[PDB]
Structure formats: structure tokens, C-alpha cells
Write a protein that binds this ligand. Sequence first.
Ligand SMILES: [Cl-]
Ligand SMILES: [Cl-]
Ligand SMILES: [Cl-]
Ligand SMILES: [Cl-]
Ligand SMILES: [Mn+2]
Ligand SMILES: [Mn+2]
Ligand SMILES: [Mn+2]
Ligand SMILES: [Mn+2]
Ligand SMILES: [Mn+2]
Ligand SMILES: [Mn+2]
Ligand SMILES: [Mn+2]
Ligand SMILES: [Mn+2]
Ligand SMILES: [Mn+2]
Ligand SMILES: [Mn+2]
Ligand SMILES: [Mn+2]
Lengths: 108, 105, 93, 95, 78, 84, 97, 99
Amino acid sequence: RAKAKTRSSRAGLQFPVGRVHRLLRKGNYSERVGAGAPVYLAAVLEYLTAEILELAGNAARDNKKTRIIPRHLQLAIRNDEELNKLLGRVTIAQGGVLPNIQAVLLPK
Amino acid sequence: AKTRSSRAGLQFPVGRVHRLLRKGNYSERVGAGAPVYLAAVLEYLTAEILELAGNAARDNKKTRIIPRHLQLAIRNDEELNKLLGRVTIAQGGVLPNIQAVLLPK
Amino acid sequence: SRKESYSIYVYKVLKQVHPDTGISSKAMGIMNSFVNDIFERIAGEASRLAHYNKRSTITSREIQTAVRLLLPGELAKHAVSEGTKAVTKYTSA
Amino acid sequence: KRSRKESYSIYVYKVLKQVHPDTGISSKAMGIMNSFVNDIFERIAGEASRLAHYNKRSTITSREIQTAVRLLLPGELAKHAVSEGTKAVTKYTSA
Amino acid sequence: NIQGITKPAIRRLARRGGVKRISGLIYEETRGVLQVFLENVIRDAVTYTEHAKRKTVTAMDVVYALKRQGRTLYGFGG
Amino acid sequence: RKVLRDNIQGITKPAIRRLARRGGVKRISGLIYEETRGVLQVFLENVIRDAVTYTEHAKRKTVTAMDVVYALKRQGRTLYGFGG
Amino acid sequence: PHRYRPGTVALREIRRYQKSTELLIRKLPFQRLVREIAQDFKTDLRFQSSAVMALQEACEAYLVGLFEDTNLCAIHAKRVTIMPKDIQLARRIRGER
Amino acid sequence: KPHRYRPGTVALREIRRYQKSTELLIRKLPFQRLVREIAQDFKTDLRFQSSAVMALQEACEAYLVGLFEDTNLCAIHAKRVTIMPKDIQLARRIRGERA
DNA sequence: ATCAATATCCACCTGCAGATTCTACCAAAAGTGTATTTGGAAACTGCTCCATCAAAAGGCATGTTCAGCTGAATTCAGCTGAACATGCCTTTTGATGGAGCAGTTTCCAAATACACTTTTGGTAGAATCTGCAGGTGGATATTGA
DNA sequence: TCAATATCCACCTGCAGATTCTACCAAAAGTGTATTTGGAAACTGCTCCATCAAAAGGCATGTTCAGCTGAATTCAGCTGAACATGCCTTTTGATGGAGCAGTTTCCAAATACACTTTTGGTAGAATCTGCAGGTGGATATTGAT
Ligand SMILES: [Cl-]
Ligand SMILES: [Cl-]
Ligand SMILES: [Cl-]
Ligand SMILES: [Cl-]
Ligand SMILES: [Mn+2]
Ligand SMILES: [Mn+2]
Ligand SMILES: [Mn+2]
Ligand SMILES: [Mn+2]
Ligand SMILES: [Mn+2]
Ligand SMILES: [Mn+2]
Ligand SMILES: [Mn+2]
Ligand SMILES: [Mn+2]
Ligand SMILES: [Mn+2]
Ligand SMILES: [Mn+2]
Ligand SMILES: [Mn+2]
């Protein structure tokens, strides 16, 4: 037969179109799943993890570190309005809190 | 011959609950007693609210349960209030209550 | 067309606790929202439970556990009772 | 033996090199990333699901995943997500 | 147009809330909040609308929207 | 196993003060410590109860970290970092 | 020629309104407002009278609920007058801001 | 004539310190016993994945830390600077935890 | 302003606890061919939903008075932070025995399919009914003198 | 306390809008058979959780002391409530008509299936390094005077 190309590659994505498609089926969401449902969902997940790794990896550089860790992921998220609102009720293990001190608390 | 509801000694559509549990993509396969059990629980809570609500109505010398009566029924019961704390009953109004510091003299 | 609801059943259960009492339609509205909601909560939780436990089927077992996680201490007891009872009966007939 | 267990680690990593070639992700950090991917998948999948149900439709097409995405994500985050989704799809279907 | 939401009504709302004394700036403050509320919910409903390819926002579209905002409403279908 | 009791004191005044600091608290009242232990008590109870239910339903005698995660998400406190 | 002292009628209004349930915003204005924002999202829409009602109920509920948390903040500050500070404070703890 | 930081200066130092770190702040063992005590008071003969006791501490500290922020917001609103039980209860009430 | 006492900040090391990169099966994608099923789709059709009047109150927008509520300013008892001495007990490191998850294989009670066979629940009209809402009439509750 | 102005609370009274009530049909909800399969037993491989030992020092615990809070008062300027007015925007009902949710079929495209080969991942090895944890030396802050 023909050489096996992956839906991911057909889509120009890094995330697993095949795996996402299965998770959709086996996940009991709808009864039937369109072909471009896994392609679109992966693309979005791939876009989002890229938007936060870009921000996270910078937090990492700003700290002389070459290896992203949770702190970096926190500062990445909690500083970007968009991402913070999105994960506004999620808590990141080992991520700490953002350096912030009410003014009325500083010496005068 | 006999509906599962009447058999389960229930006033709720066991058959219907069953159809829905199946329809609304929850599981792949649905046990045979889940539709019963669930319908039992649903009925219970319903009877639970109706009595407290009907009691709220009798205390208003009214014989027909309106939303006010369902709101006063719920907000006045820890259990029902917690279970419905993030739900708002249209036309329910609010429990009369005024903070002390706001009273005269 | 047809648009089914729990109305009859609500009203049925109503007369068993206050045969003397009636019910505004608006009230009947709120009663459905209620049953639909709770129905959805329990069902949804039961759905997850099976998944966490990699089970292909939602049994009254999930529906119970689901009710404990979902209903306030005392309410849960009774609900579990009524549910266990309503099944034990149904099943022995 | 010790049955294998899927993850999103591989792809998180690929994407990492795509933006920060020299940067590496620790382990706990990758631990988060999965939670996130899973978490957001679940949110979208569900709304997508819920949406289909509301409309008496038995299938979740890419169109479901899209509305889902606009309700879930905010501001630009959503706009960019859709641009990327749509793109990645037509490219797929476009042979 | 939001100004249409009069001082008196904002006054009544607060009263049912148990408020005894309102500050002059409370009014413009309330309208802002009220707007942000209607904007977030209306936007959500209309998305559900547009999805069903309709040109009419139904009560269910609000209810569904409202449930997404954690503002579950009882009495219009669920 | 020896009997477990009054472990809620394990949450030392030192610790609770530390927490308040990360919470950006300058001055701490003297009653804050017992109030905090009270709040923590309930938080734990509520989260353990739910986690331990997810365990029992799985016919298990071990509370897996996943039970806690499912427990927390039900409680509206989604955690990242153990979920997988 | 009689006159009630400041705050008295206010309490009366509190008692009167926590007792009733009629909506407290004039229907028309509200509907006009709803439709105005709606236009900004999708054009030339229609509205089930019941969807507008749904919104006004939800909205009025919200506002009232918020007035309560607000008042409690004003009392915390040892006041009896709710001011922007309070709605602000409350909304932040609520996590809407 | 020993040196001495005016009251409130070490606090700020401690704030600036702890917000920069991410280490847990309650002692591990004391906290593991509290989990085990509370747990066994629900069901006996229970066991915990190490990972699970951690998931809980990360959760509690995360919660208490964040609660204190709202609590500080409340004290401050009271033209105060010292958090007091009033504050925690006002936060939790508005938080919708237990009104 | 000026030191003197500390605490904070930055760069320079470098072994190793973890993160990368290898390697090697096999669980599950991708390919194909072959039955369903879905849900756009061109017409059609009774609701619903805008528009338009078109008066009538209410109900809201104003401008007044002044009651009393919120800040500002001043005080000061003593609560709560800082610094220290003392030594408890959490941490660290490891090693072990089994309690129990988990991975494999059997299959029998139980759930799903299908084909029909009856029973219901929803939909329209058809006969009442419960309050809303208006009406005295009689104490209450406020508030001024 | 006495006296007067409004509020509130009752007991009725009587339509009017909703509500129970009185009949009938497709869509479900039981039935009877046949087929299929999930997940309960039993067993066993093996992870990893509970324990115990020991040593070391990071910290929690208590105590002294006094800076500077929080809690009280007092005071009056002026923000916001109670009101009497004046009039216009909202409320209420009918139309009348157009847009349009909702069906109703056609059926070409899109999914689900069955399963057969093909590889991309995942689970341990083998191979590597970012940086934790130390150490000094500036720099920057605080707080006394
Ligand atoms: Cl699709
Ligand atoms: Cl079952
Ligand atoms: Cl303000
Ligand atoms: Cl207090
Ligand atoms: Mn880049
Ligand atoms: Mn064993
Ligand atoms: Mn019938
Ligand atoms: Mn009346
Ligand atoms: Mn099987
Ligand atoms: Mn000691
Ligand atoms: Mn002193
Ligand atoms: Mn002060
Ligand atoms: Mn004055
Ligand atoms: Mn390969
Ligand atoms: Mn270092």
C-alpha cells in the first residue's frame, strides 16, 4: 500500500492528531467524532502550550536559569492577563506567589 | 406489563431517567438499577423541597406554592441551601434580614 | 411537537406531602430546573467515577458514591437510603 | 509488565525547542504542562460535547471544538487559538 | 443608554440587599459592574445562538450562558 | 501504631506566620493562629473526605495522589503537578 | 408638617423590598440596554421575551447578591454607607477582579 | 549598644523573602500526621502514596497563602495593618466558603 | 548628614542528582474496503417577535433643609514584633518486610440488539378558584413639644 | 408624657388570570429472544508504603522589652436622606405583517466498522550537564545620633 503519513504531519502539527482523536472517542463526549475535530483540538492545545512555554522560558532566562521549572511557569502565567484569567482557579504546585506588597505596608 | 417505576415503588419515570442516562453520553453501558436508584434520589429531594416549600406557603396562609415559597424554603435550610448555594431562583426574592448596626437607637 | 418535562411527577410527589397544596406554574418551572440540574450533577459525577476507575458502565454503585460526594451530610444519608430501598424493592419484584 | 502509560511530554518538549532551542524543561515543570494540556483538553471537549447535545446533534465536528474554544478562552488567546485551529484544519483537509 | 438604569432603581436593588446608606459615587460604580455583567453573559448567549445558526437569542441561550458564568438560573428551562 | 492526637498543633505559630508572609502580611493579630488552624482543619477534612471516598469506591486501602487531585478539582481547587 | 429622620424611611424600604420580589429595574430601559450590547456581538438579532426576562432576573439577582457582600465590607470598615471602595473590595475577594 | 531593627522591618524582609521562594512552609512530618489523623477519623487502616500527602500540602499552603492575601486586603480596608479574625471571616464569607 | 551594623546581591566553583539521548518492543495509529448515518438542504408554514399606535399614570428628575455620619486629629494602654538563649524533634539516610496495587487469564451474570406490542405523556379545549388588589377601621410606630 | 401624622395590620369582598379537568394520538417504555461482553474471581508478580535506627542541627518555644499600633474620643464640615413638585418615559393592550424557528423529506458526503500491516511512543539503560549549595566581596539598607 501507500506510505504511512500521520494526520499530525498532514496537519502540520506537533501534537498527536491520532491520540487526540482517540481520547475524544473513548472520552464519552458525543457519539460520533468528525475528522477535523481532533485536528482542530490538537492545534489549539499545541498553540496554548507554546504560548506559555515562550513566556515561561523567558522567565527562566530573566533568572539566569536555562531550565524552565514551576516557578517560571507561575510567573509566566500570573503575569499574562490572558493566561492568568484562563488558569485563574488552577494552582501550580511548587510555583510560589508573585512578588507583591501593598503600598500602605512600606515605611514612609 | 408493569412500569419499572411502579415496580421500584417510585413516582418517577425510571424508564425515562434510564433513556437519558443512556442518551446524554455519560457512560458506554448503563447498569439496570442506576436508572432506578437515581430516580429514587431525584424523587426524594423533590419531595424534600416540596414539603418545606408547602410549609412555607401554609405559614403565609396560601395554598399554592410559588417561587417565593421555594426560595424561603431553601435559604432557610442549611442542607438545601448548601446544595443550591450557586443557584438563583427567579422570582424568589431574598430572606428578610437586616444587619444589627443598621437599627435605630 | 413534543417537549417532555418532570411536571407530572413533581405534581404527583406534591400531593403525597401536601394533597391540600397546589403549585404555581412558575414554581413548576423552578422544580424542573432543579431536577434537571441535580440529575445532571449526579449523572456527570457518576460518569467521571467510572472513568477514573476505567469501567465501561455506570451502575447504581456510581450513582450512590456520586450522591455522597455531591449531597450535604444529612441529605446524602436519606438519599442513599431512598435509592438503595427503591432498588432493593424493584429488583425483588 | 508495568503497563505503559501515555503522556503529552514528547510534544511539549518538541514545541519547547521550537521557541527556546537552548532552553530545557525540568521534570516537575513538565509535570505541570501535562496537567494543563489535559485540563484544557477536558474543558474544550466538554463544552464541545455539551454544545452538540444542546443542539440535538450526535456529532462533535471541528465546528463544535471552535465554538467551544471561543467560550473557553479569552481575548487574544482565543483569537489566535482559532486562527491556528482553522489553519491547521483546512491544511489537513486540503489534502 | 445604560444611564437608563436609574438612580432610584439602583437604590431599590441595594435596599433589597439590606443597604441603608448609599454613597453618591455608588451609582456610576454600579452601572459599570452591571454592564460588565450583561456584556459577559450576553456575549456567551449570543455565541450559543450563533452556533445554533439562529438569529434569535432564546431563553435557553441565556440559561446555558448563565450556567457557564457560574450564575445558574432556575425557572426558564433549567 | 501509637494514637494520633492534637496534630493540628503541628501547624506551628512559626509556620502560620511564614504563610502570612508569603501572603504579604506585615502585622499578625494574636488570635490569627487559632483561627487559621480552624480554617485549615476544615479545608483538610473536606478535601480528605472527598479523596477518601474516591478511594473507597475503588475498593482500595491506599489513598493515591490522584484521589486527592480528583478530590481537589471537585472542591474547585484544581491542582497541577501530580495530575499526571 | 411632619418629617421622618434620616435613615428611617431607608430601613422601611429595606423591609419592604426584602419582602417583595418584583423586579426593580424598569423593563423597557433594561431591554433596550440588553439589545444594545447584543448588537455589538451579532447584528440584527431577535430576543425571546423570556430570554430578556431570564437576563433581568439573573442580573438583578447578581446585583443584589453583590450589594450584600458590599454592605458587609462597609460594616467591616465601621461605616454604614456603601461606597466604591466596598463594591471594589468585595468584587476582588469574589475574584471577578 | 546592640543594633536593633525597628518593628516591621524584619516582617517586610520576610515577605520579600517568602514571595521569592516556593518551598513549602509547614514542616513535613507534623503535617503528615495531621493528614493521617484526620484521614483515619473518616476511615481506618488507610495508607497514603507519598505523592498524595504532598498533593495535599501544596493544596493547603496554596489555599492558606491565598486566603491571607484576601485577609490582608480586609484588614487594610479597615484602615488597619494587623490581620485579625474579623478579616479572615469576612474574606471567607465573601469568598462564599461559609457565609 | 554620617557613620556602623547587617543584610542583600552577584559572580566564581564543579560534582551529581536529575535531565537527555539511546535502544528496543508492541500497543494503537494508519491503510483499505465496506456497510450505516448525518445532517446540510430547497420548500413551506404557523408561531413569535418587532413595529406602531396611544393614551394614562406612575415614577423619576429636581432643588431644599438639615440631620448625623465619616473623617481628621490627638491620645495612650499594652499588643505584637525583634532579638536571644535553650535544646527538641524534624530531617536525612538506609535497609526490610509485607500489605496491596496491578497485570493476566477465565467466563457467567448482565447489558445490548432487535422486533414488536401496549401504555403514556404531551397537546388542545374545557370547568372552576385562589389570590391580588381595593376598602375601611383599628391600633402602631414615629417624632415633635 | 402628651398629641398628631403616617404606617401597618385585619377582615372582607370579588373579579380574572391561571389552573385543574375532561378527551385523544405518536413516541416511548415494557416484552420476548438472541448475542455479546464487561469486569468479578483467583492467582501472582513486584512496587512501594509503613517502620525502625541514629545522628545532627535547623527551628520551634519561651521570655524580656518597648516601639508604635489599634481603639477611644471629640468635633463639625458637608454628603446624602426625606420631601414636595413637575412632567415624560414606561406600561398596557391590541393588531398586522414579516421573519423564521421547526419540520419534512432527499441523498451526497462523512463516520463507523472490521483487521491487517506499519510505526510512533513509552520503559528502562547509557550518557550527560544545569545548577544547588558554598564562599567572598562588593553594594545597599537601616537606624542611631
Ligand atoms: Cl470535522
Ligand atoms: Cl446497575
Ligand atoms: Cl470610594
Ligand atoms: Cl477579630
Ligand atoms: Mn523563540
Ligand atoms: Mn499480599
Ligand atoms: Mn394518559
Ligand atoms: Mn392582599
Ligand atoms: Mn472481555
Ligand atoms: Mn525548647
Ligand atoms: Mn510604652
Ligand atoms: Mn492608628
Ligand atoms: Mn451640624
Ligand atoms: Mn521508530
Ligand atoms: Mn546559589
